[PDB]
Homo-oligomer: A and B are copies of this chain.
Amino acid sequence: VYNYDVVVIGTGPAGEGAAMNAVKAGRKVAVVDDRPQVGGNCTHLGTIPSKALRHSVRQIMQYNNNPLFRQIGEPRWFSFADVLKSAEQVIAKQVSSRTGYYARNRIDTFFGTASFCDEHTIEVVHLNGMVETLVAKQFVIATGSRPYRPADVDFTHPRIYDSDTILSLGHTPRRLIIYGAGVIGCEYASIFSGLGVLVDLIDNRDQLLSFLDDEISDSLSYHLRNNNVLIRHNEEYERVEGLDNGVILHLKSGKKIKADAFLWSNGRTGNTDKLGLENIGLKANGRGQIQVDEHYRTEVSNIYAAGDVIPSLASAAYDQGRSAAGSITENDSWRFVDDVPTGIYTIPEISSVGKTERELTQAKVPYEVGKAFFKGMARAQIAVEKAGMLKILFHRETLEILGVHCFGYQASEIVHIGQAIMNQKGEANTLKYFINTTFNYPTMAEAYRVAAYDGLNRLF
């Protein structure tokens, strides 16, 4: 039996941020997770592995399309195992760094499944048979989520995978079917298209990423189509059948598609069933999520939830966990993480912040559009990333930025300047900043300047 001030369940970004913020306040913190190593889904099955796969695919594509390396020989494909091999060193380094972060602050860890006993007591059970009783005054729930698994899909089939088991692939398939047009599905479709796999992306809606700007979605769809990705719209699956050599999907519309593999990316379910929320009066909705208020507080006053258990973004989860820890400690570090810069790490990347075009049109705001195309950008030309764009929506009278959308090379790393300018108050948030500020050159931030001018010419 151990006693602590605050106990956090799950060692993902939310749990790590909550524990670090709470221990920074002078309290005693503990962390519980079921994985054999620290890091959570973000490092072991989420952000890090898929991002390493994407970066390796991009490097392979650039090497193949670079004439300088064509003197070495004819273009050569790479096995999926060799591509995935690069992620092991990165995940090992990340887990080592996180363990060092925990150890340097004297943070106690327990590597076992956590179950609830009462409002202040939990039992951690390891695989071997640890049965340790933990009592804490404050609780943080950061158990994340898992891929949604419908019953009628034989996930035990060797040729059917989800967003987690897809990394178990040993050989590169010739054909692939991806279901669900979510962020994960689009990212994996882009990665496998870069690898050279004819993948037939399936969408339940008519437009990919309807929450994004219409032009950005159109450009992404066109690029995917030009990159061997076949996009089908307004489709719902009827039956998935595994075979010896492939997987056949029968849609409700009547189309039957056969591939050499299958990936499911349609939604996620909260990983809270094993916790046993009935011992504290808490309940989980149909998606497995936990309802929280603006203070990230559950129905129980001393129990808090943050992260994927409620935009399902790793940075958003980390900030939500830190805010929940601040609410626990009440050290003027609480904030409701609501404005999250949307980022899709396809090839090329996509990012957005603030209002889109359709919302502005619906609200009848007198705005204007400033565009800067990456094809004319020195850095984009020099990186051989010719495709791309940057769009700035700015108020036509007050010159206040209402939304920034970018699609191309280094989208996420240049959306941040627009985000910083947008967050300013009143006249401080002005497009004219991009004219009265000297940037570097040749970089991607220079596009902002061009975009600004492309707005100012449209202003009379």
Contacts and interface: CB of A to CB of B under 8 A. Distances in A.
A104 interface: yes
A86 B67 contact: yes
A333 B378 contact: no
Interface stretch (A132-140, A216-224, A292-300): A216-224
Interface stretch (A120-128, A154-162, A309-317): A309-317
A346 interface: no
A305 interface: no
Given A196-B104, A230-B369, A444 B341 contact: no
Given A424-B424, A435-B333, A445 B376 contact: no
- The bracket for how many chain A residues form the interface is 35 or more
Given A222-B218, A440-B343, A83 B56 contact: no
Nearest to A343: B440
Contacts of A439: 315, 341, 416
Q: So how many copies of this chain end up in the complex?
A: 3
Interface in A45-91: 47-48, 51-52, 55-56, 59-60, 62-63, 66-69, 71-73, 76, 78, 82-83, 85-86, 89-90
A77 to B, nearest CB: 11
Contact of A441 (B314, B421, B442): B314
A24 interface: yes
Contact of A341 (B48, B72, B94, B438): B438
A451 to B, nearest CB: 13
Contacts of A174: 105
A271 interface: no
Contact of A382 (B55, B371, B410): B55
Contact of A47 (B42, B73, B441): B441
Contacts of A86: 67-68
Interface in A355-390: 369, 371, 373, 375-376, 378, 381-383, 389
Interface in A183-234: 196, 206, 214-215, 218-219, 221-222, 225-226, 230-231, 233
Interface in A13-66: 13, 20, 24, 42-43, 47-48, 51-52, 55-56, 59-60, 62-63, 66
Interface string A91-105: 001100100100111
A218 B221 contact: yes
Contacts of A446: 315
Contacts of A435: 322, 333
Contacts of A275: none
A340 interface: yes
A419 B444 contact: no
Contact of A206 (B47, B214, B417, B438): B214
Nearest to A358: B206
Contacts of A100: 196
Interface in A311-364: 313-316, 318-319, 322, 333, 335, 337, 339-341, 343, 351
Nearest to A369: B230
B73 A72 contact: yes
Contacts of A218: 218, 221-222
Interface in A156-175: 174
Contacts of A206: 214
A413 interface: yes
A436 interface: yes
5 contacts: A90-B378, A214-B233, A315-B441, A416-B439, A423-B437
